Design an enzyme around this catalytic site. Structure first.
Site, PDB file in Angstrom:
ATOM      1  CD  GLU A   1      -4.933  -1.882   5.832  1.00  0.00           C
ATOM      2  OE1 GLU A   1      -3.841  -1.587   6.395  1.00  0.00           O
ATOM      3  OE2 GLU A   1      -5.548  -1.076   5.101  1.00  0.00           O
TER       4      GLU A   1
ATOM      5  CD  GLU B   1      -3.041  -1.582  10.632  1.00  0.00           C
ATOM      6  OE1 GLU B   1      -3.833  -1.498   9.659  1.00  0.00           O
ATOM      7  OE2 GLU B   1      -2.527  -0.586  11.177  1.00  0.00           O
TER       8      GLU B   1
ATOM      9  CD  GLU C   1      -2.958   1.246   2.270  1.00  0.00           C
ATOM     10  OE1 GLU C   1      -2.823   0.546   3.280  1.00  0.00           O
ATOM     11  OE2 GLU C   1      -3.862   2.107   2.183  1.00  0.00           O
TER      12      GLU C   1
ATOM     13  N   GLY D   1       3.640   2.017  10.565  1.00  0.00           N
ATOM     14  CA  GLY D   1       3.425   1.354  11.859  1.00  0.00           C
ATOM     15  C   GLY D   1       2.923  -0.062  11.655  1.00  0.00           C
TER      16      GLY D   1
END
Ligand code: BES
Ligand code: ZN
Length: 866
Positions: free
Chosen positions: A260, A294, A117, A257
């Site tokens: 998902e 997530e 992503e 961080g």
């Protein structure tokens, strides 16, 4: 580097319904074979345009026929003359070892892992790298068995074999169609914590947490939080996990961080690994947050995804709202609300007043990774919360239910989500939709009147949003404005007009409007914008005594803390003007007394007392001023700390000692007492020097957890106590092997008020625990200096700016996504005095002339220099 525009959205010419991937894995050279089943939707003469970055093409086949009707251009493989339905086979090479930018497939220590992503999958193979293309993935991984015994991808393990020459392979299949940003691959050698969750309808889920060898002792808390998150999502939202395995992999080298990826989350190990001697209460609560966050994307992001990247907030705002609901339900709602409001007012407002200002649904993007922002996230979630406020819980859950029912299995838009809430609830949200398309913070001005003769109270509320760099036109918003009215006893006056109750959530939908309340039997003290009910700046002419009255009487703990902030705001502003005229701090007696009263209130939740006794950061203080004076703000914060430490010395030491706890528990009541105790310590560090040094040193050495030890060390640094250098040296000697623990120490160095802070920061570029190759270390040392030491970063000699330019000259080539996080302090130049702007402008012009300027930095530099 070309801007892309939300209004250019067009359905894709081709869909890919299924993709079968084979990775022949090697750190120097990975061969990717990608077999995709494609379907034309567009005009029969439209070429298939695939995204690809830094890919070495080996072959192109359509139905097994080597293809001649193609060409490569910048970032694309354009393939012409195709049937309506066909099998595309691409073979290509990539090089994980050379991937310093950490996007697509890369190396994390000895592991191989991915980040896809927003547009990282096009770094792995030529693909429809756009989130409205959803395909069923199957993934075969082939690798050296000794080096990569675990070979992981999304879904379920459907096949496995051994090969000659010490190789093996595993095939995974993920039954849910997904956009490729949700693709994950991990290869390496891990310790694995295994456990299970049984969903409310009886589905048994294998939970698997992959950590570097030796870290199994730091894994149980993340595992607990996972089960907590799954349980909560069932209780609050009625949502169950939809697969049989849930894997999380903690990696040390990661730009963000966590991520998902369906059934296979990849986490910065910062948000996984905790032990009571390495991790603070704040780490524990962050792990819970990020694990939960997530997890919550499994539905709000995965099962329903984003039609395009301009809809990012559809998943991020809503999932942040969810992780806040989770943290708040499980912990202290008041503390969570307080901290999220600090972030809004102190960090997000600043961004909405910046050249990078954008609506939660952006209209224009050059580099999509530049838009994972405080605005899309935190303001996004405030917008969701306003929906919740307008609809109430029951109708809100109905709108969630209609949202999933209509959109499960597809990529949706922000407008779809609004439409589901509106239709399920019959609350009209057409005006409300303006929060999605308008940037900048509205300023809500309140004037009031009490009429003794008619026993009516009148609020005249107005709103404006100042223009932003990106938007010359602004219009009024639909602003839910919650109020409460207090009589002289601190009792809530029933809201009503002409004999009928009135909802306490007022609909502020015009530029100016009046609200009249009847049967107001006493002149009220108003609480305004209760629980920060709209993300707006409140302009109301409070008296100090209205505010101390609220600190004492307001029903909700948030309003008590908020009153304390309005009280302080006045005197922060007073004392910054004084600082600029060479004058010492001045604070009326009755202000210190409000804080004495909080310390000695025996009925106050310690969690609340602790937040009231935590002063605004230098970033929340900055937002009180048009032009920022970073040195005045820093020094006033310190002087305010010293004044209160002196006025409240006895009460502070009594409350510090009373909140002692010999057992360490990660439990909310203990966390709250310890947060209050350490807030008391912060002030005590700034009182008499010998007492302070004794107290701080003693706490550092006797601490039985990292929370009390760091609080001590960090007070030693803040107040420059005599013990500072020995304690800092000791932490270094104990913890230097451990990056995540040393990040805490780099932060303390980076944010020191010492005169020589920059010289120390530069020397630390050579520290044994520091490396330019690790985003955590960069952020902890360099990012913390530039972003969290504004006084030193904005040294008048301009040395802060020159330092950052040097670092960004490196990072622009090494890791543009980290470079672009780090440039942010420089793009705030318009908030500073003319001498400072001139030096920051010059630094930015230096960066703009870099050969091979990344798009990530180009976008911000050009908006900033405009
Ligand atoms: C908001 C937090 C709970 C954690 C946050 N992660 C997320 O929001 C994930 O859900 C994002 N989908 C991860 C992401 C962040 C930035 C750029 C690309 C991808 C992060 O900072 O990684
Ligand atoms: Zn997210």
């Amino acid at each position: 580097p070309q801007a892309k525009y939300r209004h250019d959205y067009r359905a894709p010419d081709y869909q890919i319904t299924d993709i079968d991937l084979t990775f022949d894995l090697d750190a120097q050279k990975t061969v990717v074979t990608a077999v995709s089943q494609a379907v034309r939707h567009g005009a029969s003469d439209a070429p298939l345009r695939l995204n690809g970055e830094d890919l070495k093409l080996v072959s192109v086949h359509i139905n097994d026929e080597p293809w001649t009707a193609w060409k490569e251009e910048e970032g694309a493989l354009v393939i012409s003359n195709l049937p309506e339905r066909f099998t595309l086979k691409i073979i290509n090479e990539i090089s994980p070892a050379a991937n310093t930018a950490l996007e697509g497939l890369y190396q994390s220590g000895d592991a191989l892992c991915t980040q896809c992503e927003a547009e990282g999958f096009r770094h792995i193979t030529y693909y429809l790298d756009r989130p409205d293309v959803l395909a069923r993935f199957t993934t075969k991984i082939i690798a050296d068995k000794i080096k990569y015994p675990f070979l992981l991808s999304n879904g379920n393990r459907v096949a496995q074999g051994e090969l000659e020459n010490g190789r093996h392979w595993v095939q995974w299949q993920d039954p849910f169609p997904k956009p490729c940003y949700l693709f994950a691959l991990v290869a390496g050698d891990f310790d694995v914590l295994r456990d299970t969750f049984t969903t409310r309808s009886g589905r048994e889920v294998a939970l698997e947490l992959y950590v570097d060898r030796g870290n199994l002792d730091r894994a149980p808390w993340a595992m607990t939080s996972l089960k907590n998150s799954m349980k909560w999502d069932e209780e609050r939202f009625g949502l169950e996990y939809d697969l049989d395995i849930y894997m999380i992999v903690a990696v040390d080298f990661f730009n963000m961080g966590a991520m998902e990826n369906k059934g296979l989350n990849i986490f910065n190990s910062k948000y996984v690994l905790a032990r009571t001697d390495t991790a603070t209460d704040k780490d524990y609560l962050d792990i819970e947050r990020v694990i939960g966050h997530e997890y919550f994307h499994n539905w709000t992001g995965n099962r329903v995804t984003c039609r395009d990247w301009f809809q990012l907030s559809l998943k991020e705002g809503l999932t942040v709202f969810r992780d806040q609901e989770f943290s708040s339900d499980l912990g202290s709602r008041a503390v969570n609300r307080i901290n999220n409001v600090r972030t809004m007012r102190g960090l997000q407002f600043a961004e909405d007043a910046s050249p990078m200002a954008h609506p939660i649904r952006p209209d224009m993007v050059i580099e999509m990774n530049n838009f994972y922002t405080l605005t899309v996230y935190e303001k996004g979630a405030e917008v969701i919360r306003m929906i919740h406020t307008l609809l109430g819980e029951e109708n809100f859950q109905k709108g969630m239910q209609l949202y999933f029912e209509r959109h499960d299995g597809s990529a949706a838009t922000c407008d779809d989500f609004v439409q589901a809430m509106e239709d399920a609830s019959n609350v009209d949200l057409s005006h409300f939709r303006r929060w999605y398309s308008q940037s900048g913070t509205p300023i809500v001005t309140v004037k009031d009147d009490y009429n003794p003769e008619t026993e009516q109270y009148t609020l005249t509320i107005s709103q404006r949003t100042p223009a932003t760099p990106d938007q010359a036109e602004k219009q009024p918003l639909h602003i839910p404005f919650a109020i409460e009215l207090y009589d002289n006893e601190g009792k809530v006056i029933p809201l009503q007009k002409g004999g009928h109750p009135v909802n306490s959530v007022l609909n502020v939908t015009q530029a100016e409007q009046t609200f009249v309340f009847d049967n107001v039997y006493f002149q009220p003290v108003p609480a305004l914008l209760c629980e920060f009910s709209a993300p707006v700046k409140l302009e109301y002419k409070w008296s100090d005594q209205q505010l101390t009255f609220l600190m004492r009487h307001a029903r909700n703990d948030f309003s008590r803390w908020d009153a304390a902030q309005s009280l302080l705001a006045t005197y922060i502003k007073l004392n910054v003007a004084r600082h600029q005229q060479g004058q010492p701090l001045s604070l009326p007696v009755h202000v210190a007394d409000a804080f004495r009263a909080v310390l000695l209130d025996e009925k106050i939740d310690p969690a609340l007392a602790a937040e009231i006794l935590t002063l605004p950061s230098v970033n929340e203080m900055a937002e009180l001023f048009d032009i920022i004076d970073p040195i005045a703000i820093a020094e006033v914060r310190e002087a305010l700390t010293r004044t209160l430490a002196t006025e409240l010395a006895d009460e502070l030491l009594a409350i510090y000692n009373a909140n002692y706890q010999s057992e360490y528990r990660v439990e909310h009541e203990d966390i709250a007492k310890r947060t209050l105790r350490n807030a008391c310590l912060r002030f005590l560090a700034f009182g008499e020097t010998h007492l302070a040094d004794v107290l701080v040193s003693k706490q550092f050495h006797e601490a039985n957890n990292m929370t009390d030890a760091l609080a001590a060390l960090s007070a030693a640094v803040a107040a420059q106590l005599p013990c500072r250098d020995a304690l800092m040296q000791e932490y270094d000697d104990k913890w230097h092997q451990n990056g995540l623990v040393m990040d805490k120490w780099f932060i303390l160095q980076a944010t020191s008020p010492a005169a020589n802070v920059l010289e120390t920061v530069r020397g630390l570029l050579q520290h044994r625990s520091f490396t330019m190759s690790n985003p955590n270390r960069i952020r902890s040392l360099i990012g913390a200096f530039a972003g969290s030491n504004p006084a030193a970063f904005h040294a008048e000699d301009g040395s802060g700016y020159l330092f950052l330019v040097e670092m960004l000259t490196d990072l622009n080539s090494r890791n543009p996504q980290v470079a672009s996080r780090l440039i942010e302090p420089l793009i705030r130049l318009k908030r500073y005095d003319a001498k400072r702007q001139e030096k920051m402008r010059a630094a930015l012009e230096q960066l703009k002339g870099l050969e091979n300027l990344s798009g990530d930095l180009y976008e911000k530099i050009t908006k900033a220099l405009a």
